[PDB]
């Protein structure tokens, strides 16, 4: 079965933004009801306002379903609010797998953080695109996920690129990786 998925927009964007992924998860066997898009306020996505919403938001979604991880999928300054929420809130315990979409990830982060769960580590798949010009690709690799870089597809583009979409899929069935808990 599948772990919730809080999905996670990017500044200036809104829940809707993943209306496509959103249908694409269902023809794919996801719960159209299980798929949990949050609104942000902050226009700019800083994370002291961000992080403590969508902590909140999860604690939520967590109290509600009854189960016991969620998974992400995060959109640009969406994917530094997670590893915020991972880093410096409450959120080590409570991810199962992330897939961030041309992520703003080192803001926070240059490595892919396992949690605070040593029964099951944080798996990541960061996408990212040579054609963005939004967020820059260094800012999304993160040291220990699988990175997967795509061409021509822009940044907000990557809310219905079909390659997107197929990686999405790997990674919310645990395709994701996180080698940071092994030795170099």
């Given at each position: 079965?599948?772990?919730p ?18 249908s ?24 002291r ?5 969508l ?13 016991k991880?969620?998974?992400i999928?995060?959109?640009?300054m969406?994917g530094?609010?997670?590893?915020y929420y ?17 992520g703003a ?9 396992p ?8 798996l ?15 800012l ?10 795509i ?7 990557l ?12 990674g ?13």
């Amino acid at each position: 079965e599948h772990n919730p998925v809080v999905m996670v927009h990017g500044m200036g964007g809104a829940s809707y933004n993943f209306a496509s992924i959103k249908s694409y998860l269902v023809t794919q066997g996801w719960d159209r009801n299980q798929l949990f898009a949050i609104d942000f306020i902050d226009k700019t996505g800083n994370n002291r306002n961000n992080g403590p919403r969508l902590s909140r938001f999860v604690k939520d979604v967590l109290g509600k379903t009854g189960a016991k991880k969620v998974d992400i999928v995060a959109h640009s300054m969406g994917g530094a609010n997670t590893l915020y929420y991972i880093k410096n809130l409450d959120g080590g315990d409570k991810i199962e797998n992330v897939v961030t979409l041309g992520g703003a990830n080192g803001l926070v982060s240059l490595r892919a953080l396992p949690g605070t769960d040593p029964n099951q580590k944080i798996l990541y798949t960061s996408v990212y695109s040579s054609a963005d010009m939004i967020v820059v690709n260094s800012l999304s690799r993160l040291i220990g996920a699988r990175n997967v870089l795509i061409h021509g597809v822009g940044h907000i583009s990557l809310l219905a690129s079909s390659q997107v979409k197929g990686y999405i899929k790997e990674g919310l069935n645990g395709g994701g990786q996180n080698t940071n808990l092994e030795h170099h």
